[model samples]
Target: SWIYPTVILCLFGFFSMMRPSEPFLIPYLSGPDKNLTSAEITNEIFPVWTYSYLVLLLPVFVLTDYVRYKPVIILQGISFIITWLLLLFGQGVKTMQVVEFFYGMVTAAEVAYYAYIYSVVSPEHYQRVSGYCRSVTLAAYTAGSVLAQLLVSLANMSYFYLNVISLASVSVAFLFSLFLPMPKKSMFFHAKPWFQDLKECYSSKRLFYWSLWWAFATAGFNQVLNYVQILWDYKAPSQDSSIYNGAVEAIATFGGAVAAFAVGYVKVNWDLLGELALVVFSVVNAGSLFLMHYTANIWACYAGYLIFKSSYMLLITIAVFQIAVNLNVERYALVFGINTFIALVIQTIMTVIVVDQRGLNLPVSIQFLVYGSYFAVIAGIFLMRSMY
Candidate 1:
């Protein structure tokens, strides 16, 4: 009962926070001097916040698991409030950069909240819950982008104005948190050492393998997401890049939601299916990247991206939901912590590579080649049933 609605609200927040900023940020960063390339904007902003998130996430992981989950969320809500206020009131690229950091901090809440909820809920509820989360998140994001575009055309809406809206929405979620049940006090703050937990998790051969794959694939996932709109713009230069990219993403999100819903009706558990879905997503994503190297036709680019985006949603959703169900409830935060750490470290490396602009030989070609290779590797793992 609670799962569906909770997932819906979280999705609402996710789309609100993630969508408009994709295209807006590059231009937004130009401040008064709007001359930076998309690559330059990416170089400037991705590392600052991605690294901050990597660092801050360690504490967030520990606090939520070894500490109190609700309080971290409460803190996150407060951070959102502050971030929106800063964005709405502040001016200049540097000021927005500051907003980006805080935005990363608050963004952690969505994952934490889901991980938290998954821990307490029964397995029977997970697929449905996860499906709703992905679907609504996709819908809201797709709809939000269009809405933002409309608003941008109509009024002089600053990035700050957008944040103001996000801030208010998250505030409502904060109040909802008051009514949600707190995780068990035994799940409350503890004194477990991070090193020990890391050692314990890694010492298990199976756990180590899983973490490695999860980290690797998720990192690739992050890279694709971080840069895809730019890829879309590059491939479809004559199009309304923002609208086109958003539409592509929005459709893929819708497709993923449909795929996830189908998963729920099947009698099989998602354990292996989830892993396999990643393989499918990776293969398709990689294939799309390779296709772009040979042909720049707008339709080909659109179709390839549409395929990649749809598969990505399915892969991420399946992995997250399966892991939540697979683990013991008490270990939820610990598992999520390890997952977050590995994924972020990978993301940090990718961001650094992009920042350096020292990509593979083809630059864009090689960059995507690397992405395709990562997908192929993951697909191999799925085919071999080796991820366990």
Candidate 2:
């Protein structure tokens, strides 16, 4: 029934996420433009991104649902423009830190993207529409990553130009953000106390376990995401070999899109097998994380990241479908917001302890080595629960 909005959002997805320079963030920071040392990149700059996003995400999440997910996306567009501008014209470590603040808002706004779809679409609409929404975003991101690789590798364009291209790309999404119709459909079928409603959502044992992995796995997933490029830069210094970080993202996101689509056709009771899948794929993620450090080959590290990301993408889609099917429309944003918020909480805890200045501040390769074992710990937690 709701076709046009989906297409518009899809277009928004394509333009906004087509971030070519994203894969080369480390390259840009380390290159002449910013000239940050490796330690500064990990310990100082990246931590600020994590910390600021963590601070903003909780309130912005509840606010996203409050504002119907529209304004935040707009705010995100504005922040997106500012972030790149800071990267280009801005100076100093603290100047870059402010970019993370806007960049924080940028991702914080992204939380709205899911909420926007959930608010507009119905429960019955979820299977087809929401599934397509996620895959479209994934597909769009893949195109952007591929485009980034081509522009960088072939044209030998400076990384600065990639941000110019991304700024223009995001500007298109912001212009379209205004025209979308507001959400009018919501079902408040049951009138219970808010606490009861909270428990009502949590009471479902199925929702409970799936929510566990959605937040739990997400924490580790995002941590790996932020760190992997650093790993790539370390494993194969750009001076020694050309960067394929963009191509790896392109390939992995494509694999993830197909994996998400594949879920629509599969006929398994997620309740029975969801955690079991978590246990297994968690192991797969761990194995890939292991491959990157142990192998020490840059190409193998790319393959390692490819498997790691595609696996996270496939599983996250399954988590979305599972959680959405169980949620009422209005409550969907709240539940997802909390999940995202909690994921960041845990991510920050890991960030401060594992990668921060006061922490052990392990080398990038060794940090990922610890991260691989982190997933193994996650798999172990689920393995015990899978039996119960």
Candidate 3:
């Protein structure tokens, strides 16, 4: 049954998505073994890793589809296994850099996982499958954060041990990936014409525009989110930062799950409401960043970040749903992979502008202001497009 494969996929997602929360990441990287300064950590290490991921996104995307989906999923799981092993046992800046490289591969490999669902399930169930898959992934992330927080706060767990647990979880996911069925044919390698696929995607203005929206909004949210940990560190510089950070992330994911569920019931005319939706959510996102910038209270910081992240998730899911509905199901992997590559390109530009040493090098507060302004500008442009 399709449901069986779907369940297996979700189970695989559940186990594989159990990454250590973002709050733990900075400290873990900056720990005694790596000994990176905060500046080096954020400005140097992160940008390099993200750019590496971006560089490979297109190639990986094409490769995944060319070989069908399962092999890429296997590669993703393998990448995770290697990443965790490095985090657990490897040390020094060079070793950490290698870890980040493999981590990028994991991100690239994710194209296959979500894309795999469309291959296995009928298009009529795309919405439900998307929600379930997203919810399961979010739930897994939330659970991981909760567990990490609990271990840290109550049992005094170390980051190294957390990596151990992550390694084990991805190992289980790798084993599960072995059992998932493969697609019979693919868009590029099969009888499908690659040029026709490209033509179908771009010939429709709505498809192209929405795809750009998906790329821009997601890239902005993710690039800005990398700085969120720095903001948390500023607001609360303590050993228990990960505890609160994990709690905030858990809360946000739970909110995101609810928001994803609610999207199913809510109706919006994409032709009429699309621009307005963009304006409203972009304003909301910008407003939250402003709040985060102005407020120093840890709780306010938490709430602001939560609102920004959860809303971004809500909107991105909407974009994903729209993309799914508009395209041929078989083209899902190709289009989404292309979309992801574009998002990464945008993200790399963002990383250079904001975080790079040669770039703005702005303080966290100013950076938030810049992020807010960027979205506000996006809202203004869309509002004009709606009017014209």
Best by TM-score: 2
- Native-to-model Cα distance after best TM-score fit, residue 223 in candidate 1, in Å: 1.1
As a whole number from 0 to 100, the lDDT of residue 284 in candidate 2 is: 92
Superposition error at 281 for model 2 (Å): 2.1
Off by over 4 Å in 1: 1-24, 27-35, 65-67, 84-93, 116-139, 149-208, 236-242, 266-281, 292-295, 317-326, 357-366, 380-388
Candidate 3, 1-388: lDDT as tens digits: 4687788899899999887634577656655545666666666667777777888887886777678788999898889889888888886667877888998888878867887776777668877887698778888998988887777778777777877888899999999888988877654565354675577666777678878988888788877777887777666655544436677788888888877777668776766776688678878888888888889788998899889888887788788777777666657766777787888888888888987777876656577777878777777777788788
Give candidate 2's TM-score: 0.90
Please tell me which predicted candidate would have the highest lDDT against the true structure.
Answer: 2
TM-score of 3: 0.90
List, in order, the clash count of every candidate structure.
2, 0, 0
Cα lDDT tens digits for candidate 2, 1-388: 5787788888888788888788888888887776678888777878777888899987776666566667777788788778887877887888988987888788877867766775676556765776677767777788899989988889979999998888888888888777677776322322233566686677787787788788878988888888888988887777777878788888988887777767768888766777687778888988999998798778899899889888887778788888887566668766877787888898898988999887887778788888899888877887888777
RMSD (Å) per prediction: 5.2, 2.9, 2.6
Looking at candidate 2, the ten consecutive residues that score lowest on lDDT are 185-194
Cα displacement (angstroms), candidate 2, residue 109, comes to 1.2
Q: Give each model a TM-score.
A: 0.73, 0.90, 0.90
Tell me the tens digit of each residue's lDDT in model 1 across 1-388: 4564465446445634444544444434443434445555455555566777887887776567654456666677677667767655666547656876887787666666656555445668765665566555566766666665566556666654655556566666566555545655425354244446655554664455556676777777767766655555566542243334445555666676676666546766455555565566667767876675456676676677677766665666555555555456557567766687878888887767654445421234456666777687677777777445
State the RMSD for candidate 1: 5.2
Which pairs clash inside model 3? none
Stronger candidate by lDDT (1 vs 3)? 3
State the C-alpha lDDT per candidate. Answer: 0.61, 0.80, 0.78
What does the lDDT read for residue 315 in candidate 1? 61
